[PDB]
């Protein structure tokens, strides 16, 4: 009842952490 | 014909582990007991060499206290003919995954064990002395915040007489700290380095992600955006070789559950026995908001 799939739409993300 | 090589990729992370830091004790049949030496009472008085008598002093307490150990059990099936064929060994894989799940549950228990039939976690027990950061009054609101000054004052304020004590926190916390900047636009601590990189080999930085981070994932609390949430846990520091003890009784054991298994099926039964308790929590300290 299972399988795996992906295409590389791993859109990058930001982080910003000021003080 | 296909070729078979002898490598196997895992691609599965367990966590960081804190079972190495705690005081390890192997045990036997349950209901262990030990000593709790309270305080050596002042015995002498000091003496001028004139009188032919001494003076008594106060005695101390022993308090032979004890504790219980908990257990872990599980069962699982197997087909009989499916095991002879299907070249890969399901049995050893199940054994390994059961020991691993027991290990991760033990790790979660020692930290946040909720009392009843749960090894009392040193987080929820809360006999550690705890300090908290001070709020900052940006444009007259006094919002809860956190800067590196609070961190030092938390780490240094430790009495070095207790011995070298390790400090633990979440990697989101380490990142948010490393991401601090002065007014010059220059860095902060962990300055000189295009390296940063949490070496943490022995010195006072240590990271576990299966701890509660106060960053709510990331970009939270601390961030140019929404402010920080108060009363949140940040980090701890203790001499875990004596601050908190982990006790083991019996290694993970598996056994074919005779009865309920036939010439067409197999049922197994596995278990183990372990626990943990607080040592001298007057050693370690906690940082909160």
């Amino acid at each position: 009842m299972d399988c795996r799939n992906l295409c590389g739409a791993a859109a990058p993300s930001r982080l910003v952490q000021p003080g | 014909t296909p070729q078979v090589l002898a490598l196997e990729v895992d691609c599965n992370i367990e966590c960081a582990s804190l079972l190495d830091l705690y005081g390890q004790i192997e045990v036997s049949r349950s209901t262990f007991t030990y000593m709790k030496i309270a305080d050596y009472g002042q015995l002498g008085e000091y003496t001028c060499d004139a009188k032919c008598d001494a003076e008594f002093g106060e005695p101390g307490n022993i308090r032979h206290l004890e504790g219980k150990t908990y257990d872990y059990r599980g069962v699982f099936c197997f087909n009989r003919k499916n095991l002879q064929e299907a070249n890969y060994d399901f049995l050893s894989f199940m054994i390994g995954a059961a020991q691993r799940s027991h290990r991760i549950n033990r790790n979660q228990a020692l930290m946040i064990g909720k009392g009843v039939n749960e090894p009392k976690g040193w987080l929820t027990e809360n006999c550690f002395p705890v300090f908290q950061t001070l709020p900052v009054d940006v444009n007259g609101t006094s919002t809860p915040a956190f800067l590196a000054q609070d961190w030092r004052r938390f780490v240094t304020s430790f009495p070095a007489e207790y011995g070298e004590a390790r400090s633990v926190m979440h990697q989101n916390v380490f990142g948010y700290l490393a991401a601090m900047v002065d007014a010059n636009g220059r860095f902060l601590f962990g300055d000189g380095d295009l390296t940063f990189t949490p070496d943490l080999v022995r010195e006072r930085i240590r990271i576990s992600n299966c701890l509660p981070d106060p960053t709510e994932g990331n970009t939270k609390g601390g961030t140019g955006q929404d402010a920080f949430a108060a009363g949140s846990f940040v980090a701890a520091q203790a001499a875990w070789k004596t601050a908190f003890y982990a006790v083991e009784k019996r290694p993970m054991f598996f056994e074919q559950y005779e009865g309920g298994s036939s010439a067409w099926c197999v049922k197994y039964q596995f278990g183990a026995e372990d626990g943990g308790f607080v040592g001298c929590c007057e050693h370690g300290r906690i940082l909160q908001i």
Partner: protein, 137 residues
């Protein structure tokens, strides 16, 4: 030669005839039950066991009172209609003979005993209290 047995096995009042008393079993890890009658019985009596959780107000003060589900051992013949643990003090028990009891699996941080309904008049003549065994800290 009596030992100070207040530093081990400290007991707490649970039911003084007309008032229940939540006892905290957090630090301790073994505890029983002692029933003592003070006068003559009329009919059999029963007591319902309840347990409490840490109220979000204060972590070391009790919260509400939830009934305790009994777990039966091997070799049991019946199940209390609801499955909630409850003890019974039978009729014809003289008020100079204790009675012992113990729930086999605890839950919660405070235990409490209440007179089961329809048997509250006799509860006045009943006094229930609990000791503990473990310290853990």
């Amino acid at each position: 030669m009596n030992f100070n047995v207040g530093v081990d096995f400290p007991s707490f009042i649970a039911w003084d005839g007309e008032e229940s008393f939540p006892v905290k079993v957090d630090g301790f890890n073994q505890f029983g039950f002692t029933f003592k009658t003070i006068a003559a019985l009329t009919a059999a009596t029963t007591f319902n066991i309840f347990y409490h959780e840490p109220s979000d107000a204060d972590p070391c003060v009790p919260g509400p009172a939830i009934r305790v589900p009994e777990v039966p051992f091997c070799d049991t013949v019946l199940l209390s209609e609801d499955g909630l643990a409850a003890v019974t003090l039978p009729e014809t028990v003289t008020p100079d003979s204790f009675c012992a009891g113990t729930v086999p699996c605890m839950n919660g941080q405070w235990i409490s005993i209440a007179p089961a309904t329809g048997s509250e008049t006799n509860a006045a003549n009943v006094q229930i209290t609990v000791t503990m065994k473990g310290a853990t800290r």
